[PDB]
Amino acid sequence: QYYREGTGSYTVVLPPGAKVPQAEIYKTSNLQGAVPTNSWESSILWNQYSLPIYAHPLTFKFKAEGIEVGKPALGGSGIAYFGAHKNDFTVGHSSVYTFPDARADKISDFAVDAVMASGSGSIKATLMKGSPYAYFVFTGGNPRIDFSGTPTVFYGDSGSQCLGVTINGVNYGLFAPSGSKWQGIGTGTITCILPAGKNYFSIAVLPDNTVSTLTYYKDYAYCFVTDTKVEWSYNETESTLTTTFTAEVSVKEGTNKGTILALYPHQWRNNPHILPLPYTYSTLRGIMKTIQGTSFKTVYRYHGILPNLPDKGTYDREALNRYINELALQADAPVAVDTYWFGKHLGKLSCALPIAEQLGNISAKDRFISFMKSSLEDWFTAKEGETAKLFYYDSNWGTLIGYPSSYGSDEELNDHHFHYGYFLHAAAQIALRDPQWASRDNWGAMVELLIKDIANWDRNDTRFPFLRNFDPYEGHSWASGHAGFADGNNQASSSEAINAWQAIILWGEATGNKTIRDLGIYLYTTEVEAVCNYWFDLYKDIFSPSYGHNYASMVWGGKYCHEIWWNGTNSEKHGINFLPITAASLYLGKDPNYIKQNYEEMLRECGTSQPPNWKDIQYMYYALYDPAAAKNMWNESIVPEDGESKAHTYHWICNLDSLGLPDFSVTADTPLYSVFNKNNIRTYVVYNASSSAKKVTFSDGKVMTVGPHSMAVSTGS
Ligand SMILES: [Ca+2]
Ligand SMILES: [Ca+2]
Ligand SMILES: [Ca+2]
Ligand SMILES: [Cl-]
Ligand SMILES: [Cl-]
Ligand SMILES: [Cl-]
Ligand SMILES: [Cl-]
Ligand SMILES: [Mg+2]
Ligand SMILES: [Mg+2]
Ligand SMILES: [Mg+2]
Ligand SMILES: [Mg+2]
Ligand code: NA
Ligand code: NA
Ligand code: NI
Ligand code: NI
Numbered sequence: 001q002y003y004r005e006g007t008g009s010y011t012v013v014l015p016p017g018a019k020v021p022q023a024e025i026y027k028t029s030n031l032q033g034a035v036p037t038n039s040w041e042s043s044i045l046w047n048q049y050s051l052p053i054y055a056h057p058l059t060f061k062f063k064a065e066g067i068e069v070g071k072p073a074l075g076g077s078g079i080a081y082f083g084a085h086k087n088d089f090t091v092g093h094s095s096v097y098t099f100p101d102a103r104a105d106k107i108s109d110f111a112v113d114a115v116m117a118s119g120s121g122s123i124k125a126t127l128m129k130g131s132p133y134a135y136f137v138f139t140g141g142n143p144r145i146d147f148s149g150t151p152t153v154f155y156g157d158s159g160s161q162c163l164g165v166t167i168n169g170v171n172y173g174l175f176a177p178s179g180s181k182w183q184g185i186g187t188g189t190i191t192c193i194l195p196a197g198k199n200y201f202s203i204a205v206l207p208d209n210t211v212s213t214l215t216y217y218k219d220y221a222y223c224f225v226t227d228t229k230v231e232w233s234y235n236e237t238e239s240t241l242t243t244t245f246t247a248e249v250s251v252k253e254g255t256n257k258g259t260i261l262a263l264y265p266h267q268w269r270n271n272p273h274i275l276p277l278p279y280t281y282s283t284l285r286g287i288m289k290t291i292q293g294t295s296f297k298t299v300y301r302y303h304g305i306l307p308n309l310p311d312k313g314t315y316d317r318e319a320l321n322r323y324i325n326e327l328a329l330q331a332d333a334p335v336a337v338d339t340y341w342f343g344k345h346l347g348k349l350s351c352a353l354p355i356a357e358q359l360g361n362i363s364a365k366d367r368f369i370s371f372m373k374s375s376l377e378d379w380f381t382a383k384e385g386e387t388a389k390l391f392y393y394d395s396n397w398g399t400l401i402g403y404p405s406s407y408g409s410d411e412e413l414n415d416h417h418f419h420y421g422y423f424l425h426a427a428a429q430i431a432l433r434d435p436q437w438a439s440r441d442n443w444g445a446m447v448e449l450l451i452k453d454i455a456n457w458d459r460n461d462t463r464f465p466f467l468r469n470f471d472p473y474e475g476h477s478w479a480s481g482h483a484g485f486a487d488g489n490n491q492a493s494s495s496e497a498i499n500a501w502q503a504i505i506l507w508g509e510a511t512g513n514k515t516i517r518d519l520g521i522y523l524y525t526t527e528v529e530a531v532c533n534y535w536f537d538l539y540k541d542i543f544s545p546s547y548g549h550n551y552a553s554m555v556w557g558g559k560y561c562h563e564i565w566w567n568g569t570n571s572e573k574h575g576i577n578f579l580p581i582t583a584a585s586l587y588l589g590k591d592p593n594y595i596k597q598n599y600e601e602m603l604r605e606c607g608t609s610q611p612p613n614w615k616d617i618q619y620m621y622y623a624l625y626d627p628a629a630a631k632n633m634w635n636e637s638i639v640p641e642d643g644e645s646k647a648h649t650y651h652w653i654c655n656l657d658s659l660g661l662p663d664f665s666v667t668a669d670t671p672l673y674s675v676f677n678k679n680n681i682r683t684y685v686v687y688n689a690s691s692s693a694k695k696v697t698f699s700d701g702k703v704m705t706v707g708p709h710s711m712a713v714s715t716g717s
Contacts, residue, residue, distance in 0.1 A: 003393070006445035008380035010400060015387040018403050019411045020394050021481065022046065028105045028115055033462030034398025037413045037481045038469045040129060040489055040557055041112040044104045046482040050114075052085030054488040054557025055129045057205055057262055057281040057288055059085040062102035062114065065146065066092035067125050069134060071170045071205050072558070074284060077546040080561035083284030084486065087148050088167045091134075091203070094142035094191055096121040108228040109466070110245070110473040128225055129473045130245075130262050132217070132281070132290070135224040136201045143192040143201045145174065150188050154209045158182045162221070163190070164206070164214045171206040173214055175221035178253055200224065200252045204260075207279040219256045220292075223249040230472040232522040239302050239667035239699075241525040245473070246295040261296060262288040265542060266475045266529045273297050284560065285474075285534060286542040300525050303664055304673035305502050305584040307432055307687055308354035310713045313654030314631070321359045323647035327352050328364035331371045335642050337388065338406035340415070342379075343422030344643040346372060347499070347580050350422075350429045351648040372426045373437065379423065380446035391449070398464055400453040413481025417454045417469035418493065421500025424450060425582070428503050431510035432689055432709075438511055448516070451504060457519045469497065470523055475530035476555070488557020492564060493576045494531045495585070501527060502584030509671050509689045517671060528587045534560065535577055536598070538591050550594075550601050553577060570605035574598060575617040580643050581652065586662040586674060589624030596625045616649040617641050627656035659683045670696045683715040 002009050014020060025035055026045050035045060043051035050062040061068040068090050072083035093099075099116035106113040111128040121140025128134070136143065147167050154171070155164030158181055163174045174190070176182075177198035183191045192201060202224065204217045227248035234241050251257055260277070265286040268274065274291050281288040313320075327348075334345035349368045356364040375389075379402065382390040391400050401410050408414040427447045431438035438444045456464040469477040477497040483489040491497065501524035508517025534555050537543045543552070543560075552560040553573045564573050578588060589595055599622050603609060611618040615638045623630035630653045640646055660678025668675075672687035673696065688694045688706040696704045706712040 002382055002384070005380075005449060006440055007442050008377070008446040009382045010391040010393050010446070010449065011382035012393055012395065014392060015390070015403055018387075018392070018405070020392075020401065021397050021399075021411055021413055023396060025396065026101055026103045028103045030105045031107065034465045036107045036465040036468070037397065037399070038416075038478045038489070039107075039471055040474070040478070040483065041104070041107060041127065042481065042483040042489065044102055044112065044114050046484060048101045050102055051484050052486060052488055052558060053112075053127055054083075054085065055127050055131070056264070056283050056285060057132055058127070058134060059558070060125075060127050060134070061085055061087070062116065063090070064098045066090050066099070066116065066123060066144075067102075067134075067136075069203060070168075071281075072284065073168070074282065074544070075546075076544075076559070078548045079563060080559050081284070081544045081547040082559045084558045085488075086168070088170055088172070089148060089151075090146040091123065091125070091136060092144040092146050093121050093123055093138065093140070094144045095140060099123075109230045110228040111225055111247075126225060128228065128247075129471075130264075130288075131225060131247075132204045132206070132260055132262055133221065133225070134203050136203075138194065138199045138201060142194050143176075145190045145192070147188050147190070150186070151190075153185055155211055155214055156182070158185055162214070162218050164209065164211070166209055171209045173204045173206055173217045173221065175202045175204070175218060177201070205281070207281065213279070217260070219254075220259050222252040222254050223257060223259050224252055225259060226250045232518065234302065234518040234521045234671075236671065237669050239304070239669065240299050241302050241521055242297055242299045243472075243522065243526065244295060244297045249294060258292055259294055261291050261293065263291065263296070264288060264474065264533075265539075266526075266533045267296075267298050269533075269539065271298060273299065284558070300529055301664075301667060302521055302525050303586070303662075304668060304671065304675075305505055305524070306672055306674050306685060306711075307429065307506055307689075308351070308583050308711075309652060309655040309659075310685055310711055311358035312658045312683070312713060313651055314657045315650055315654040317359065320355065320647060320650060321361055323645065323650065324352065324356050324359060324361050324364045327645045327647055328356075328361075328367045331364075331367040336406075338404040339402035339409060339419040339423075340406045341642075342375070343419050344580075346375065346426040347422040347582075348643050348645055348648070350425045351580070351582060352645050353429055355647050355651050369430070369433070372430060376423065376427060376430070376443065380443055391446070393463075398462070399468075400449055400464075408481070415479050417477055417500045418479070418496040420450045420454050421496060421503055422580075424500060424503035424507060428506035428510055431507055435511075438507075444511060447507065451507070451516065454500060455504065455519060455523060457515065469500075470527070472526075475526045476534065477527065483557070485556070487559050490554055490556045492554045493579075494527065494535050495577050495579055495581075498524060498527050498531070498584065498587075499580050499582060502582060505584070505671065506689075512690070521671070524584065531577075531587075532590060536594060538594055550597055551577070569612050569614075570602050571611040571614045571618055573605075574602040575614045575621075575641075578621050579617050579641065581617065581620045583674070586624070588621060589662050590664055592625045592661055595621060599625070614641055616644050616646075620649055620652050623653045623656045624661060627653055627661075631657050659685075666698050666700050666702075668696050668698045670694060681716060683713060685711065685713050687711050
C-alpha cells in the first residue's frame with residue numbers, strides 16, 4: 001500500500017526488479033525500531049559474525065570462537081597508511097568453543113552491545129568508540145582469553161584480581177571480579193575462574209607497562225559503559241555550536257565512579273573545556289588524548305553559510321546570461337535518472353537558479369524552478385504501478401529508498417546522504433522562494449522524511465534510526481551501509497556529505513524550523529572540523545610522515561589513502577572532496593596556503609602545469625587562493641563536470657575576484673552570512689530568510705539591517 005505525507009506519498013510495494021537490503025538482520029529481540037546502519041559497528045548486523053570493528057583505540061572482530069581484540073600496528077608508505085585490525089587476543093568461553101553468530105543488542109551514539117549465545121553459554125560484549133576499555137558479561141562459563149602467542153605477564157599471578165599483560169608490544173589490563181583466579185598463566189590461553197555470582201569481565205589497552213598506570217585503569221575497569229549520548233546546541237548570538245558527549249556507567253564493584261574517554265584530534269584540538277590525563281594513544285586518526293569523566297564538550301565557531309553568492313562579480317554579464325540560457329536549454333536533461341544522477345542535476349539547477357534571478361532572466365528562472373518543482377513533486381509521490389521516480393519504505397531495516405537506485409543505495413544502503421543531499425538542496429531553494437510549496441501540508445512532509453532517513457534527530461521516531469550517515473564521535477559521515485570490508489566503513493566525498501548538511505540548514509531556516517536548522521548546523525560544523533583533520537590535515541599533525549600526500553581522498557576505519565573508486569586522474573582524486581561546490585563550500589578555503597599546496601600537489605601528481613580535467617572544479621577551488629588567476633585560466637572550452645555549469649563556475653570565480661577570500665576571523669549573530677576580505681577590505685553578505693527585518697551584528701562591529709526574504713551586501717566600515 002501507500003502512505004500519504006502532505007500532498008505526496010511513499011509506497012511499501014516494491015517495484016518489479018527493485019532490490020532491497022537482505023532479509024536477515026543479526027540483531028536480538030532487544031534491538032527495536034529502525035536498525036542503525038552506515039556506521040563503524042554495522043557489519044555485526046549484516047554478517048553472521050562481523051568484519052573488523054574500528055572503534056579506536058581498540059579494534060575487534062567477531063568469529064565462531066569469540067571476540068578478537070587488538071590495537072592496530074600503524075604502518076605503510078606512499079599512497080596509503082594502515083591501521084589494520086589484528087588479533088592480539090580472542091575473548092572466548094571455557095565451555096562454548098563455537099557460537100552460531102554475533103547479534104547487535106543495543107546501539108548507542110558511540111557504543112554497541114553484541115551478544116554471542118548458544119544453549120549452554122553466552123558472551124555479551126560492549127565495544128566503544130573513544131574508550132580504551134571493552135566490557136563483557138558471561139553466562140554458562142568462564143572467560144577463556146586465547147592470546148596470539150604467549151603474553152608477558154608484567155603484573156599479577158593466579159590469585160590477583162587483575163593481570164597486566166603485553167602481547168605484540170601492546171600492553172593490556174585484564175580485569176576480573178574480586179575473588180577470581182587465573183588458570184593457564186605461562187601458556188597461550190588464560191582462563192579467568194569467575195567467582196560464584198560474578199560474571200562481569202573487562203579489558204583495557206594501556207599506554208605503558210607500569211604498575212601505577214595499571215592501578216589507575218583498574219580503578220575505572222568496573223564502571224561498565226551502558227549508554228552513550230550526544231546533544232548539541234547552536235548559540236545564535238555567539239555563532240557557536242556546542243556538542244556534549246555523555247557515557248552512562250554501571251558500577252560492577254568498588255567505590256570509584258567514572259571512566260576514561262579517549263578523544264580524537266577534532267575533539268581535543270584547541271578545546272579549553274578539558275584537562276587531559278597524561279595518557280595518549282597513537283592511532284590512525286592521530287594522537288588520541290584522554291580525560292577522566294563521564295562527559296565532555298566541544299565548542300566550534302560556526303562561520304555562516306549562504307544560499308548563493310551575491311551579484312558582485314567581475315563577469316561579463318552578457319556572457320553570464322548566455323551561459324544561463326545555454327543551461328536553460330538543458331534544464332530538463334539529467335544525464336541519468338537514478339536518484340544519484342537525478343540529484344546531481346537538481347543540484348546544478350539549484351546553484352544556477354539564483355544567478356538567473358540576479359540577471360533578470362525570468363525565462364531561465366522559470367524553466368529551472370518548473371523542473372525542480374515538477375520533478376520533486378513526481379519523486380515525492382508514489383503512484384500505483386509506478387516503477388521510477390518514487391520512494392519505497394523498507395520496514396525490515398527502516399529506511400526510505402528511491403527508485404531507480406544506484407551504487408548500492410538499495411541493496412547495501414550506501415550513500416543516502418550523498419543522493420538525498422541534492423534533493424534537499426533543491427527543496428530548500430524552493431522553500432526560500434515559496435513558503436506555500438514547502439509547508440508540511442504540501443511538499444514539506446516528504447522533504448522531512450528524506451531528512452529523517454539520513455539524519456533523524458528524534459530518538460522517539462522509530463521509523464528511522466538516529467543520525468544514520470553521521471558518526472557523532474568520529475565527527476564525519478560514512479558511506480557504506482554495511483561496513484563489510486577488512487578496513488571497515490569508508491567515506492570518499494566529504495563534500496557530498498556536507499552538501500546534505502548545508503541543505504538541511506537552509507531548509508530549516510527557510511521553513512522557520514529551529515530544530516531542523518540547528519541539526520544542520522551541528523552536522524555541517526562538525527563534519528567540516530573532521531574534514532580539516534582527516535582529509536586535508538590542515539594542522540600537519542594527523543598524517544604519517546611516510547604517507548606521501550597532503551590530502552587523503554578516502555578515509556576508512558582501518559586506513560586512509562589517496563585512491564578513489566575509479567581510474568581517474570589526480571585532479572579527479574582531489575576534486576571529489578570539493579564537489580559539489582555551493583555557497584556553503586567556503587570552508588575549503590580556511591587556509592589559503594593549503595589551497596595552494598593542495599592544488600600544486602595535484603598538478604605534480606598529474607604531471608601537468610594545469611589540471612588535465614575537472615578544470616572547472618579545480619579553478620573554483622584555486623579561486624579560494626588566487627581568484628584573478630583562476631578567472632584567467634577559466635574559459636568556455638571547459639566542458640563542465642556533470643553537476644556543474646559554466647554559469648555557476650564563472651559566477652563563483654568572478655565573485656571571489658570582486659569580494660575577496662572568505663574571512664574566518666569574524667562571526668555574526670545570524671545563521672546565513674559570510675564575510676570576504678580583499679586586500680584588507682571586508683565585504684559582509686547576509687541572507688534574511690525570515691518575514692521580519694533583521695539587525696545583524698558582526699564581531700568586528702559591522703551592523704547591517706536586512707529586509708525580509710532578501711540578500712544584503714555591504715563593503716567596508
Ligand atoms: Ca512519482
Ligand atoms: Ca512519474
Ligand atoms: Ca550514524
Ligand atoms: Cl590486582
Ligand atoms: Cl564492591
Ligand atoms: Cl535573454
Ligand atoms: Cl508521481
Ligand atoms: Mg553478526
Ligand atoms: Mg593462544
Ligand atoms: Mg606532518
Ligand atoms: Mg578566462
Ligand atoms: Na593523473
Ligand atoms: Na553549462
Ligand atoms: Ni594529491
Ligand atoms: Ni573564454
